[PDB]
Structure 1
Amino acid sequence: NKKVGVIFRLIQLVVLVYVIGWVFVYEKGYQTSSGLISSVSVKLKGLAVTQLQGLGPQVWDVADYVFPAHGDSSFVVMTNFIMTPQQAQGHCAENPEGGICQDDSGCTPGKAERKAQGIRTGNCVPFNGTVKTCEIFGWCPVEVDDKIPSPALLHEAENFTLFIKNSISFPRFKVNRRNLVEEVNGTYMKKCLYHKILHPLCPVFSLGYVVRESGQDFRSLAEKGGVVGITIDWECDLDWHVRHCKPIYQFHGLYGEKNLSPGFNFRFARHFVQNGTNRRHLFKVFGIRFDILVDGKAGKFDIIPTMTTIGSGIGIFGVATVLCDLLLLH
């Protein structure tokens, strides 16, 4: 039948056009993918002043709210903290959430199995006017995290400037690229803010804009901390000029249930010596966690991948033809 032959030739032309176009153009068959070596260098620039009751104006600069100072990809930006200054290793009443005692016989000398707050001496001392806690030996007085100020202390850190410097290089092709491209110049970085449509190549990111693009409100996040994931994609074609290689930034919001362990927090201490007595300042920082992930590939024309793709296409063509013949003969 002529119609059977027409259908066979149509299927043959379809599969041939497919194997000659799709894998070659969309899948980049004539090209070869290769990994890159990425080193993330982040740099912020902003000032936040937090005024607390009983303490003077606290000045916080880039070195203060950015705890990883060596330029690590994973860094935390301080937004809310609880200040517990002038801690000494001495006897004090333990935190009330650890345990409540009504008499000295209730306390047991030793160390707590879970949430150890100090070396219990077996004495029940009054923590305050109402409740009493077992005396412990440790840094004192114990930090009380119970109260969380609803307004963020470092609320000025919402619209800060975040500069991410990423340099990637492909060892196979020996091509080194950086986030700073030929389109971006010195005067451009001085007056640009990152945007998905307006300024896609501007390396200066706004913290509030980054948090809002991920799908999270900055105020509720900074109130108790959080995690924001930033990804940089370096998908490009080496067949064109190096100016076409431009990094693409995607922001992903990492959030969980607020009923169980809401936000992200941690504690750090600054050890100093004053009046011959070693003292420290403990801060429970509720800050946003920023993680930079870089994943990209580069493809250039090569003989061996092209030949392998041609062979695979010829094989698929033959398989399709023999299968069509088998289906037609029934």
Structure 2
Amino acid sequence: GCCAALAAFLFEYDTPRIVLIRSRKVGLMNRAVQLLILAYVIGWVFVWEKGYQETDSVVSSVTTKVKGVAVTNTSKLGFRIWDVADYVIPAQEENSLFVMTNVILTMNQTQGLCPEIPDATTVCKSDASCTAGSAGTHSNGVSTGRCVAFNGSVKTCEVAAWCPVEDDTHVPQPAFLKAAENFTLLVKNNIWYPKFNFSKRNILPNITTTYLKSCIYDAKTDPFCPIFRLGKIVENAGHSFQDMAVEGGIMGIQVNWDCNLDRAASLCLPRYSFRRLDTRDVEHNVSPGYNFRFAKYYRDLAGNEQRTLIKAYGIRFDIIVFGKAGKFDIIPTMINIGSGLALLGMATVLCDIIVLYCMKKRLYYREKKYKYVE
């Protein structure tokens, strides 16, 4: 009878048959193991590690602005003023910003033939060691193979390049824009969590416009002013701006957005940390510090092309935004609950082993627990 079988299946309750053993040690051990398992599952997984939540990564957009003006009066270049349009090269970048702190200038360059800068490699005699067509270590010109005089004292191999060639052997010390220590950087950060449809910006609602006009970041006093001083950024990373400015470097400004969305949206706050992303190693490094070469192109009255070659040393400021949001989800909760329910049987397994193999009445309990079908 299909109907009778269906009724029996629906109208009958099936439960396992249990055997109760009065044993103080085994009972206490079983309860202790179960308590340890429950303490794990609750405290470590749910309360501590937030095992009831789904996680989403952040999508960020960053905007940077710099302020400050520097004054220099040197011999080669004379009195000058450096505003933001001068020392930030280029005017706009993405999640990054380069401030020039030291420079080498080669002005009024022309295409032609000229001697190389004296050194062990370039110095030649009798036009013999020179080889035509070789770019050389400098990669600034192509050798012609004709020894020519650099000055009345020494003679060097000739190259076809922009002339006169750059002499980048003597980096100015102290740095040229050493007042860049005192400039301020404003970081505007807008974040987005697509999974939870949540957006926020690093300028908090209680940060007024009057406050932003005179605040400088300070973890203890002003932990939410998004305006930083470059010297103090470098200092907070454990380094020195003056030392770091002679050859340049890379600094990371690190914004952390690790906020739980089960709470008020006013508690999703950014945390700022600073880290140097360049390494000082004089045995396992190539191209230390940080610099790059760009050129300014002009025209002579005769119509020929001039250029000024700038080797710009400075500090690059990268803005690194990371973090995960968390919101309650039922899938991980049920997974953890089921896993704990499964793990609760380990206590039964261990206690059964102890009862059946580590007692004097281990043959009585074996007879009671196991029923043999001959």
Is the TM value for this pair above 0.5?
Answer: yes
Q: Which residues of structure 1 form unaligned runs of 5+?
A: none
SS of residue in 1 equivalent to 2:308? strand
Q: Which residue of the other structure, out of 288, 312, 319, is the alignment partner of 2:315?
A: 288
- In structure 1, what is the equivalent of residue 289 of structure 2? 263
Task: Tell me, yes or no, if structure 1 residue 46 matches structure 2 residue 68.
Answer: yes
Q: Which residue of the other structure, out of 310, 321, 325, is the alignment partner of 2:351?
A: 325
Structure 2 distance, partners of 1:107, 1:249, is 55
Deviations 1:75-120 (A, max 9, x none): 3221111111111112211222451122234422212354323122
Deviations 1:142-188 (A, max 9, x none): 11111122211111101210111121101111111111112322112
Deviates more, 1:1-10 or 1:256-265: 256-265
The 3 A distance-change label for structure 1 pair 113 and 156 is closer
Q: Which residues of structure 2 form unaligned runs of 5+?
A: 1-22, 359-374
Query: What is the number of residues matched between the two proteins?
Result: 329
SS of residue in 2 equivalent to 1:252? strand
Amino acid across the alignment from 2:145: G
SS of residue in 1 equivalent to 2:66? strand
The 3 A distance-change label for structure 1 pair 200 and 164 is same
- In structure 2, what is the equivalent of residue 91 of structure 1? 113
- In structure 1, what is the equivalent of residue 365 of structure 2? none
Structure 1 distance, partners of 2:35, 2:58, is 39
SS of residue in 1 equivalent to 2:297? strand
Deviates more, 1:151-160 or 1:121-130: 121-130
Structure 1 distance, partners of 2:232, 2:86, is 22
Q: Aligned-pair distance for 1:33?
A: 0.3
Structure 1 distance, partners of 2:343, 2:228, is 48
Task: Tell me, yes or no, if structure 1 residue 201 matches structure 2 residue 228.
Answer: no
State the identity %: 48
Contact 1:94 1:117 in 2 (8 A): no
Amino acid across the alignment from 1:315: A
Q: Which residue of the other structure, out of 249, 259, 267, is the alignment partner of 1:244?
A: 267
Task: Tell me, yes or no, if structure 1 residue 60 matches structure 2 residue 82.
Answer: yes
Contact 2:30 2:348 in 1 (8 A): no
SS of residue in 2 equivalent to 1:33? strand
Q: Aligned-pair distance for 1:245?
A: 0.6
Structure 2 distance, partners of 1:132, 1:322, is 91
Amino acid across the alignment from 2:351: D
- In structure 2, what is the equivalent of residue 272 of structure 1? 298
Q: Work out which of the two has the higher radius of gyration on C-alpha atoms and give 1 or 2.
A: 2
Structure 1 distance, partners of 2:353, 2:118, is 80
Q: Which residue of the other structure, out of 118, 127, 131, is the alignment partner of 2:150?
A: 127
Amino acid across the alignment from 2:310: F
Contact 2:26 2:351 in 1 (8 A): no
The 3 A distance-change label for structure 1 pair 324 and 295 is farther
SS of residue in 1 equivalent to 2:225? coil
SS of residue in 2 equivalent to 1:236? coil
TM-score (norm 2): 0.82
